[PDB]
């Protein structure tokens, strides 16, 4: 970001638009500067802005504690405002503790990911060219330190791999380039419940052609090939995530061959009537949506001639409408949520139960839930700050799993609803008739 010093706080004492640090003042003195709207960039070392980054995020959570659902939305709004003021310069190689070619010592999170001899000799130059693609030295004179930390983690995903444990058996690694959200330990368990569900329900349900929506890093696509689904196809609106996922499928051996990745907004194209792509009907459609704190709260209706919902409820109603055009008969949809839509927004009604009871387009075939076992960030957008889930929110979250089928396909799944220990609705018992 290139600063405009005329709109800053003190353009007379600080004509550059920011307040340099020099590594002498306390953390709460920097935190008082950031809360008033002053930009902060280091003068000499990266350690001064790294110490100001960790302490301000810790001081902000003490002033705004996460006591309920409305306190996490305010804390995420406050932390996004303050961490944008903590800048670092674009030419970070002129700082002191970037690399030392003689002592092989450096400060930063690159020492967690790379070797000392490998960084200070050859990898400081490769990272210098890695930032130039996404943030050129011409257009940007300063970088947000959250973007500098994400560039160091994405350079690790470019250099070496990123294991998806315990989803992938210790040797299959993905390479998300930049701007592609990877999965943490909390983001893995809705896919860990799905992988155990797909291990047992493949063959009783005869699932062959799987369709994965909003793949991101491709973790939901690679988890289906491990359970035995032969034909998987992924749809991702990010074009750079599509090129990286199909390159990782070549790198991950010869058991990922029928995997396909296309660019689409939510679903495939379905535009040509002469080429007829409608013969490719999927029997299982998977959706693993992302749930951010800003997106879960501001769900409301917009549009006059095309009235549509926004946020997490609007993403679900896009999935709940156009899934019938791509599903075969006797086919199911699989939704992987994480119960934060009901925790961070408890006043609004349940969005998944609003489709089943009111719209009456889908029938609840099965439902599972499992409590959260680990800790970490949840649905982390890459160039923003990290926020780990507190303990009182972690103990009530649950990794959900929703299996729905068509309202027209009641007569095929009618004997599934007749078994003991199942919950048939009142509409599928009237269609069975002994």
């Amino acid at each position: 970001i290139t600063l405009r010093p005329d709109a800053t706080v003190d353009p007379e004492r600080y004509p550059l638009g920011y307040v340099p640090l020099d590594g002498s003042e306390s953390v709460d003195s920097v935190w008082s500067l950031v809360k008033s709207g002053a930009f902060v960039a280091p003068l000499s070392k990266i350690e001064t802005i790294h110490r100001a980054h960790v302490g301000i995020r810790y001081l902000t959570q003490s002033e705004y504690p996460a006591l309920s659902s409305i306190d996490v939305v305010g804390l995420q709004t406050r932390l996004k405002e303050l961490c944008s003021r903590l800048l670092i310069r674009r030419d970070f190689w002129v700082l002191d503790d970037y690399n030392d070619p003689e002592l092989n010592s450096s400060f930063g999170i690159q020492n967690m990911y790379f070797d000392n001899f490998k960084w200070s000799q050859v990898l400081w130059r490769r990272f210098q060219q890695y930032v130039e693609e996404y943030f050129p030295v011409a257009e940007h004179t300063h970088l947000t330190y959250d973007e500098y930390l994400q560039l160091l983690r994405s350079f690790s995903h470019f250099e070496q791999g990123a294991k998806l444990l315990p989803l992938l058996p210790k040797r299959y690694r993905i390479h998300p380039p930049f701007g592609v959200p990877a999965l943490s330990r909390i983001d893995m368990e809705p896919l860990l419940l799905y992988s155990q569900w797909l291990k047992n329900f493949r063959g009783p349900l005869k699932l062959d052609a799987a369709l994965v929506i909003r793949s991101g890093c491709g973790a939901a696509v690679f988890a289906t090939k491990l359970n035995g689904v032969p034909i998987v196809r992924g749809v991702d609106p990010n074009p750079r995530a599509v090129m990286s996922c199909r390159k990782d499928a070549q790198r991950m051996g010869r058991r990922f061959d029928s995997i396909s990745f296309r660019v689409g907004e939510m679903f495939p194209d379905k535009d040509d009537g002469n080429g007829v792509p409608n013969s490719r009907k999927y029997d299982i459609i998977v959706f693993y949506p992302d749930q951010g704190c800003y997106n879960l709260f501001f769900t409301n209706a917009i549009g006059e001639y095309a009235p549509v919902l926004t946020g997490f409820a609007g993403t679900l109603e896009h999935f709940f409408e156009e899934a019938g055009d791509y599903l075969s008969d006797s086919g199911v949809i699989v939704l992987c949520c994480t119960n934060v839509y009901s925790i961070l927004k408890p006043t609004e009604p349940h969005p998944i139960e609003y489709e089943i009871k009111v719209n009456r387009r889908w029938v609840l075939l099965d439902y599972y839930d499992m409590p959260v076992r680990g800790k970490g960030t949840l649905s982390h957008t890459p160039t923003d700050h990290h926020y780990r889930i507190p303990m009182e929110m972690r103990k009530c979250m649950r990794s959900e799993l929703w299996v729905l089928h068509k309202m027209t396909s009641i007569a095929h799944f009618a004997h599934i609803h007749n078994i003991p220990g199942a919950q048939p609705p009142s509409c599928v018992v009237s269609h069975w008739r002994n």
């Binding site: 003689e102 002592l103 092989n104 010592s105 070797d115 000392n116 001899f117």
Partner: protein
């Protein structure tokens, strides 16, 4: 900055704190790198030079013999016969403490202990103009088994040998 590191340790070893405090005061004012944070107050501000006292002692006469004596301001001298007997007490007490050897020093100051010097060429480096007397870098800069794997030779024949 290498000259200030050596010259400070020489004045400390040779029992000169006025010359060492003035060296830290000079390097902080000139902007020498590594010494902009170390700045000492001049506790010898009112005291004259050490050579000027020895010149005055060879040639007010009550203050001439006690010009070398340093006072806090809230201190007063003794009578001239009593203070001169007290100055010989501190003379024989200082040499009594400095004549006792430290038992595990090999007759060396603490500056001399673990102060082996070879130039920068001894540890994987070559000529640079700004490194005048550059101490060779420690062995923790280059670890073995991170440059070459096990049972494979590394191109550092005389690195770890001091």
């Amino acid at each position: 900055p290498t000259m200030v590191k050596f010259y400070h340790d020489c004045l400390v070893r040779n029992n000169r704190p006025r010359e060492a405090s003035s060296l830290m005061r000079l390097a902080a004012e000139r902007g020498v790198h590594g010494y902009e944070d170390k700045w000492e107050a001049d506790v010898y501000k009112g005291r004259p030079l050490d050579s000027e006292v020895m010149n005055e002692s060879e040639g007010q006469a009550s203050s001439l013999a006690f010009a070398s004596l340093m006072l806090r301001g809230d201190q007063r001298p003794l009578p001239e016969n009593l203070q001169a007997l007290l100055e010989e007490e501190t003379t024989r007490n200082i040499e009594a403490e400095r004549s006792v050897p430290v038992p595990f020093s090999a007759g060396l100051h603490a500056t001399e202990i673990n102060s082996v010097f070879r130039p920068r060429v001894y540890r994987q480096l070559w000529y640079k103009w700004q490194h005048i007397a550059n101490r060779y870098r420690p062995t923790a800069a280059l670890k073995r088994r991170q440059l070459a794997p096990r049972d494979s030779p590394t191109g550092i024949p005389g690195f770890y040998r001091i």
